Amino acid sequence: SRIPVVLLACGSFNPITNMHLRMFEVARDHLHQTGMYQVIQGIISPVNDTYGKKDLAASHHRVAMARLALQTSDWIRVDPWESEQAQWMETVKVLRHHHSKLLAVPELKLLCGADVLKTFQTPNLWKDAHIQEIVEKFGLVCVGRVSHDPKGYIAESPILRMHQHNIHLAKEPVQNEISATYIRRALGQGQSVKYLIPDAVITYIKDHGLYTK
Amino acid sequence: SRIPVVLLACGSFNPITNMHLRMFEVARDHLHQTGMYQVIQGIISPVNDTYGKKDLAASHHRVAMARLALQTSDWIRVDPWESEQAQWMETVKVLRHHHSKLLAVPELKLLCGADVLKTFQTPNLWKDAHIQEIVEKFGLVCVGRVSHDPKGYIAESPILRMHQHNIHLAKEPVQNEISATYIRRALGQGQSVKYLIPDAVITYIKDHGLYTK
Amino acid sequence: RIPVVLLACGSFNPITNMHLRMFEVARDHLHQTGMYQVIQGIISPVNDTYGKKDLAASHHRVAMARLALQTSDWIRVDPWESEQAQWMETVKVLRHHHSKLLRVPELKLLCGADVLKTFQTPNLWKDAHIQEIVEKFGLVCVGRVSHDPKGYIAESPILRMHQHNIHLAKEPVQNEISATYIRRALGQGQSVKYLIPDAVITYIKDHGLYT
Amino acid sequence: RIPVVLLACGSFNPITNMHLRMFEVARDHLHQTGMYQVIQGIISPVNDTYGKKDLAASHHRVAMARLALQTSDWIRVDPWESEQAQWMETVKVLRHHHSKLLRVPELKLLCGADVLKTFQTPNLWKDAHIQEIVEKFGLVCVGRVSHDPKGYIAESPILRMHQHNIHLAKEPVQNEISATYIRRALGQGQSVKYLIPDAVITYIKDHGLYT
Question: Which helix (H) or strand (E) holds C5?
Fold first, then answer.
C-alpha cells in the first residue's frame, strides 16, 4: 500500500489566499496519482512576527484568517506553533518540530512554489546543510509558477539533483496570477478581492479593519 | 451623481467558476472608479440547453449551481429566463428582455472577456446590426484575457471604434488560468477543483453526480 | 519513421516570433514521439478577400513571412493560397498541398490550442471539414494560455474519435504575442523589436505598413 | 528632456529575447513620460566568481550579448564588470558607470519586477544600497507575471520614499522566457530558435556551450 504523508506550508499568509489553498489540493492530487503516497493532512504554519523587514498583519490575525479559511477543508489545518515562538525560525527547524510532533511514521514534506526552489541558489540565503536535510530527510512538493523552470533548478543544483527523487513537481495549473501583495494593495484602495481569497477571510479583514492604508 | 448600471453575463456557466464571479467584481470596481456609474446589480444568465454542439449539464443544474455560488453575493443573482426559453436566443435579445424588465432607467451592459470582443470580427458569426445595437444601446464591460488586445480589437473595428465610449475595458487581473473546460476535465478524472470554483458548487456537483466521464 | 510536413494557415499580419516558435515546438514534439520525422514547414498566408479588415496586402504578408524565414532551413512560405481568386476553406488548402506532396509524407495542420476551441463555435466550421482534417490529415496543436486542448478533444464527438492524428505540443514558455498588439504598437510608433524578426520590422518601415 | 542611460545587470547565461525586449519596453516607457530621452543601453554580465553554478565563461556570455546586440543601434554590452577580479555589488557597478558618464545623463538600473521583490529578502540586500540605487540613481522596472511592483514599492519604507526615481514600465506582452529553461532545452537537444537571437544560437553551437 501507500506511504502516509503530511504536507507543511510555511509563509506569511498575509492574508492566506485561494491560491495558497489551491496549492495543497494540487500537491495532494499529484502525490496520490503517483500511486505510492496517501496525503493524510495539510498544515498551514504562518511565519512568526519577528521575521523580515516587510510589515505583516499580526500573527494572531494571520492564524485566525487561516483557521476561518480552512473551515470548509476536511484535511488542512492551521498550526500556530511557529508563530507563537519567541523568534523567527529557519524552515528546517519548523519541519523538525512538526516531524517530532508526528512521532512507520508519515513522511513530512514541505509544500512550496517553484520560486522557492530558485531561492536555494541564492548565495548567503540558505545553509547547504539545510538544503540537504530538507530535500533528504523530509522532501519537497513544488507547485509550478510562471517564469520558473523547476526542472532546470533541480538539474543545476548538485544537492537537489542527488536527492531529486524527494522533490515532487506537481504539474497542474495553480492560480499564479494572484499574489498576496496584490491582494493587500487592492484592499488598501478599497477594491474587491472577493473570489481571490475566501469569503470568510474577507469578513474577518473587514470586521477587524486589517490592510488599511 | 451617477448613472445606475446593471451588469449582464451570458455564457454556459458549465459550471460557474471563481473566475466568472471575479469578472463581476472587477467590472464593478472599474465602473465605480470612473466616478460616473453605480453598479446596482449583476445578473448571471445561463445559456439555454438547445445551444451549441458541445454537451452542457442541464440548464436546471447550471442555474442551481449559479444560485448556490451567489448565496454569499449581495448584488449578483442568477436569472433563469434565458434558459427557460423554448430555444436558444441571440445575445441582443437577452439584453432587450432584461432591459424591458428594468423598465431614468439604469443602463444595461454586457459583461464579457476580451476574447468575446475578438469574435465580433469573425465572419458569419455576428450580424453587424447586432454588434451595433449591443455597443450603442447597451454597452460592454470587457475584462482582460491573456493573449488578447482589446484596444486593438476596438481600433480595427469601425463599429466598435465609433461607439468605443460604450466599451469599458477593465484593467485588473482576472483569473485567466481557469477555464471551465479544464474544471470539467479535472472533475471527470476525479481531481480536486476546490478553490477554483465555489465550495457550494462542488457540493452540488458531488450530490448530483455531475461531470462524470 | 513517417515523414511529416506541417502547414500553418492564418493572416500573418504580420508574422511574429510566436508564429515562428510554433513550428519549432511542434517539430521537436513530433520527433520526441519517435514515430515521425518533420521534413518541411509551410506558412500559408490567407488571401486578401478574407473577412477581417485592416489586412496588409497579401504580397506584403508573404514577403514578410519569407524574410522571417530566411534563417530557417526547413520552413518556407507558400503564396498559393494568398494568390487564389478568393478565400478558401482550410480543408481546401490542405487538399491542394496534399496534391503537391504526391505530385509520401503526412500533411498536418499546425495551429494553436485556441483554434481547437473555435471548432465548437456554432455555424463556424463544418463537421465534415473538422472530420476530414483529423481523419484524412492530422492536427498538431501548440499550447496557449487559458486553453485546455485535452478538454476540447474529449468534448468533441469528432475529435475524440481521431486522437491518434491529433498531437498536443506543450509550450513551456509563455511567449504569447498577439499580432493585434503588434499592429497597434506600430501604429503608436512603439517598438516591437525582439517580438517579431528584425527583417520584418525593416520591411514594415520601408513600406509604410501598419501606420 | 533629461538624458538617460539604462544599465542591466545579470548573468545573461545566455542573453534571451526577453532580456532584449526589456530595454525596448523601458525606453518607450521613459520617452512616453516626456521628461526623458534614453540615449544608451548597457548590458553588464556578472563576473565569473559569482555564486550560482553552471555559469558559462564570462567572455562567452559577453560575446553572446554583443552578437545579440549587433542589430541594436542604442544598446551595447560592457565587459568591465565581468572583467573585474571578483563579484561586485550592484551599487558598485552603478558607481563605476556613473563615473564613466561624467568622464550629464542620469544612470538608471533596469530590471524586472521580480528584482524588486528580492529587496525584501532578509540579509540579501543592504538597505543603504537599495536607498542609494533609488536616491542617487534610479530604477526602471519592467513587469513580470505574478509580480505586483506597485505593492513592492508601497510596502518598502525606502522605495515608497523615492517614487519619482522608480519607473514602472508595463509589459503588455507575456514574453516570459527564463534562461534556465533555455539552458535545459539546449541540454536536451531541443530548439530555442525564436526565443533567443539566431547569432547567439550559432555561437552556442560553435562553442559547445550548455551541453
Answer: strand C2-10
Note whether A22 contacts B194, CB cutoff 8 Å: yes
φ, ψ for residue D59 (rounded to 5)? -60, -30
Distance CA A35, CA D61 (A): 44
CA distance D45 to D80: 9
Query: CA angle A126-A131-A137, nearest 5°?
Result: 150
End-to-end CA distance of chain B: 53
Q: Give the residue carrying C-alpha cell 478568393.
A: C86
Which residue do the cell numbers 512568526 mark?
A48
- A46 half-sphere exposure, CB direction, 13 A CA radius: 26
Whether residue B179 and residue C146 make contact (CB cut-off 8 A), yes or no, is yes
Report whether D138 contacts D108 (CB < 8 A). Answer: yes
C-beta pairs of D83-86 under 8 Å, 24+ apart in sequence? D83/D47, D83/D58, D84/D47, D85/D49, D86/D47, D86/D49
Method: X-ray
Q: Tell me the residue range of the domain where D152 lies.
A: 1-211
Torsion angle, CA of C179/C185/C190/C195, rounded to 10 degrees? Answer: -20
- C-chain residues near B185 (CB < 8 A): 148, 150-151, 154
Q: How many domains does chain B have?
A: 1
Scanning every residue of chain B, which has its alpha carbon at the shortest distance from the alpha carbon of C155? B54
Contact present, A138 and A100 (Cβ < 8 Å): no
Closest residue to D28, CB basis, from C28, C72, C190 = C190
Chain D: give the shortest CA distance to residue C203, in Å: 15
CATH number of the domain within which C166 lies: 3.40.50.620
Chain D CA closest to residue C26:
D191
Report how many Cβ contacts below 8 Å link chain A to chain D. Answer: 80
C-alpha cell at D82: 565581468
Q: Which residues of D touch A (CB under 8 A)?
A: 50-54, 114, 117, 120-124, 127, 144-148, 150-152, 154-156, 176, 178, 180-181, 183-184, 187
CA dihedral of residues C16, C20, C21, C23 (deg, nearest 10)? 150
CA torsion angle C158 C159 C162 C168 (round to 10): 170
Is A128 exposed, middle or buried (CB count within 10 Å of its CB: 0-12, 13-18, 19+)? exposed
Q: Say what the resolution is, in angstroms.
A: 2.2
The whole-angstrom distance between B212's CA and the closest CA on chain C is 12
> Under an 8 A CB cutoff, do A172 and B178 touch?
no
Asked whether the CA dihedral D7, D159, A192, B198 is positive or negative, the reply is positive
The single residue listed with the C-alpha cell 534610479 is D138
Nearest residue of A to residue D126, measured between CA atoms? A53
